[PDB]
Amino acid sequence: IQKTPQIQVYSRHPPENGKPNILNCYVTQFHPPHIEIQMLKNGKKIPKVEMSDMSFSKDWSFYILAHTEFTPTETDTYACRVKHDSMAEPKTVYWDRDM
Template identity: 45%
Template sequence: MKYFLCFAILFYLGSCALGKQFPPKVQVYSRNPGKLGEKNTLICHVSDFHPPDITITLLRNGVEIPDANQTDLAFETTPGNLTCKMEEVGVKKNPVVEVNLISSK
């Protein structure tokens, strides 16, 4: 009985540790230094999260950007609002980063 109780306690502590969630870090940055009138690439980078079950969505002016690759979300920019939205399973409040891209004209 003593061994069963020890096993049950160890199992409980192990499952609590595995179920711990770490908040993600979301960054939006440009590939090159910004120059007025020149094309650049914005990168949405999500890191430092656990568990690894997440969804990253890129939106331009509130509309999802079609065919965004989940492993490399770099793309050419045009003026408007860019939103990088990360959703993690089991988390109610997920980070959202929004950048306003200003027209050079």
């Protein structure tokens, strides 16, 4: 069973420039478990990233959260890049603060 991970990127609070917040990258519905998840600020890897909330759904697919503290500005862009066997090339999802 091989399932492509769903990648969702979002903040804890509605983004406000200059105000501390939390950026999340929830990677879900994937199998096998081997996977690489990285959060990026302006194309540069963020060092302080916590991995948490790992679990599986009814169909056994894996779920896991990567999150980090951050203070959004008007110019800074963030993204989550995932490498998984179900994908030929690493997938990068950008944070859309207007969603």
